[PDB]
Amino acid sequence: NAVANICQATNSQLYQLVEWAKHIPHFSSLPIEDQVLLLRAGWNELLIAAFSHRSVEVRDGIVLGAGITVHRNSAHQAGVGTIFDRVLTELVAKMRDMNMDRTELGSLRSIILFNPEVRGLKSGQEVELLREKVYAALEEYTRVTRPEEPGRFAKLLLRLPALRSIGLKCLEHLFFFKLIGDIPIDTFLMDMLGS
Amino acid sequence: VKPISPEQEELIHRLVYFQNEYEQPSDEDLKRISNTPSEGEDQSDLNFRHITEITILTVQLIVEFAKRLPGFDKLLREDQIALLKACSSEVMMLRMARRYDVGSDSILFANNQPYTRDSYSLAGMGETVDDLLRFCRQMYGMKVDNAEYALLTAIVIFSERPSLIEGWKVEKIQEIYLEALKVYVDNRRKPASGTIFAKLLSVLTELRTLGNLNSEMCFSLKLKNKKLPPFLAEIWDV
Ligand SMILES: CC(C)CC[C@@H](O)[C@](C)(O)[C@H]1CC[C@@]2(O)C3=CC(=O)[C@@H]4C[C@@H](O)[C@@H](O)C[C@]4(C)[C@H]3CC[C@]12C
Numbered sequence: 294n295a296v297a298n299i300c301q302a303t304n305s306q307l308y309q310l311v312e313w314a315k316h317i318p319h320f321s322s323l324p325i326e327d328q329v330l331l332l333r334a335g336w337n338e339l340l341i342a343a344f345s346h347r348s349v350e351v352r353d354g355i356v357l358g359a360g361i362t363v364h365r366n367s368a369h370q371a372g373v374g375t376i377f378d379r380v381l382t383e384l385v386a387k388m389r390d391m392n393m394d395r396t397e398l399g400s401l402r403s404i405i406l407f408n409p410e411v412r413g414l415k416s417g418q419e420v421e422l423l424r425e426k427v428y429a430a431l432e433e434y435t436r437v438t439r440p441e442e443p444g445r446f447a448k449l450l451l452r453l454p455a456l457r458s459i460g461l462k463c464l465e466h467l468f469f470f471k472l473i474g475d476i477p478i479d480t481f482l483m484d485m486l487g488s
Numbered sequence: 489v490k491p492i493s494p495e496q497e498e499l500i501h502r503l504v505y506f507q508n509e510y511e512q513p514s515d516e517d518l519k520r521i522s523n524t525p526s527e528g529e530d531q532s533d534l535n536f537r538h539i540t541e542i543t544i545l546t547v548q549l550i551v552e553f554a555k556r557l558p559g560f561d562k563l564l565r566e567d568q569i570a571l572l573k574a575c576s577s578e579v580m581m582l583r584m585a586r587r588y589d590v591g592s593d594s595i596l597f598a599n600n601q602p603y604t605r606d607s608y609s610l611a612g613m614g615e616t617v618d619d620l621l622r623f624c625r626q627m628y629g630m631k632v633d634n635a636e637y638a639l640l641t642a643i644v645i646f647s648e649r650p651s652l653i654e655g656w657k658v659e660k661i662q663e664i665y666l667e668a669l670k671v672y673v674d675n676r677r678k679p680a681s682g683t684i685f686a687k688l689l690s691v692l693t694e695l696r697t698l699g700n701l702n703s704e705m706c707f708s709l710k711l712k713n714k715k716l717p718p719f720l721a722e723i724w725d726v
């Protein structure tokens with residue numbers, strides 16, 4: 294509800310994003326330039342997916358962090374004003390209706406992260422193999438966990454285009470402008486990735 | 489290992505049929521396009537004219553194909569129009585990919601004239617053409633066949649779009665084409681069909697970006713003192 298708290302929340306979301314990427318299997322073994330490229334490309338989709346999935350318990354709102362849930366009237370002030378409605382409609386509501394669990398969310402976000410179609414990669418084939426592993430694993434998981442619904446794999450995969458569309462409504466890297474220094478994003482990523 | 493049901497085979501046959509049926513503009517329309525050099529225009533104006541004027545025919549073909557898909561006539565007119573407006577550019581990207589020539593790294597138009605990177609650049613559309621051709625290349629690398637293209641096009645058409653009234657019905661229709669694609673891919677790709685289904689569904693995700701890249705022209709055109717044909721301008725909310 295307060296500005297400073299929201300800023301703290303979103304900054305924390307950034308830090309958490311990088312931490313999450315860091316501990317995805319085989320990601321930190323890629324050349325660091327490639328990690329920077331992949332994170333730059335998926336930045337918005339990854340954040341949006343994460344907080345969308347956190348927003349399912351809450352009604353008519355987007356959870357941006359510890360004790361900070363945002364409704365439509367404060368959405369603009371939170372930095373999500375432009376994508377709020379589509380996020381609630383195409384993502385949160387959908388994640389709720391089909392009961393998307395955490396393993397599936399993690400799979401999807403992994404798929405987003407491991408995009409071999411990102412320009413400038415050195416290890417593109419390796420990235421593609423990783424993405425493929427994620428596909429196979431996810432299909433396996435949905436086939437075992439929920440066998441009553443056989444169209445669940447595709448239904449999960451169909452949220453990826455929705456995420457891309459919403460992420461594209463953003464002509465900037467989400468929440469990055471509320472970091473404190475004049476530290477450029479690539480430097481922030483390099484620093485937060487290397488040990 | 490699950491086989492194609494007879495209903496699914498009928499559906500796929502229909503799709504392949506429609507796709508072949510509405511793939512090319514009539515010879516009359518093309519001949520009309522080639523035979524109107526207005527006033528002594530340069531190569532640039534020629535390329536632009538051909539690209540846009542043929543693109544009109546392409547959109548008309550897309551509509552003809554869409555209105556014949558099983559399920560489409562079950563929707564409200566409002567949702568039909570909404571879908572068409574929202575998906576025409578993406579479907580257009582698939583049609584384009586089907587005419588990519590690897591050897592020349594070019595797109596072969598319906599008039600058998602090859603269009604390269606330089607053709608588009610000269611037309612005033614250089615900012616985007618590399619992305620277009622890259623999509624074509626990726627698509628080619630996946631070795632996508634007729635049924636897969638048809639099914640993908642159907643799936644793109646029946647995708648979730650903003651401002652839908654009966655979005656649930658659209659989703660339900662889309663499920664069927666999804667399952668048909670999954671089964672087809674399972675039974676007709678060798679030796680197995682590892683992840684090629686998900687790999688094909690990523691194409692949708694890329695089509696969102698390409699559709700945006702196609703909406704993102706016409707501001708570029710206006711800046712070059714060039715102009716989209718009004719039909720295309722309306723259809724793509726430009
Ligand atoms: C803004 C707009 C005009 C640009 C759109 C452009 O970037 C596109 C996507 O590059 C357009 C331009 C020309 C184009 O319309 C085509 C010409 C054909 O002859 C054929 C006609 C028809 O048989 C189609 O199945 C394929 C193809 C190749 C289409 C595909 C889409 C193309 C290639």
Ligand SMILES: CCN1C(=O)C=CC1=O
Nearest residue numbers: 372373374375463464465
């Ligand atoms: C700056 C405008 N904007 C938003 O409101 C949400 C993402 C974005 O870029």
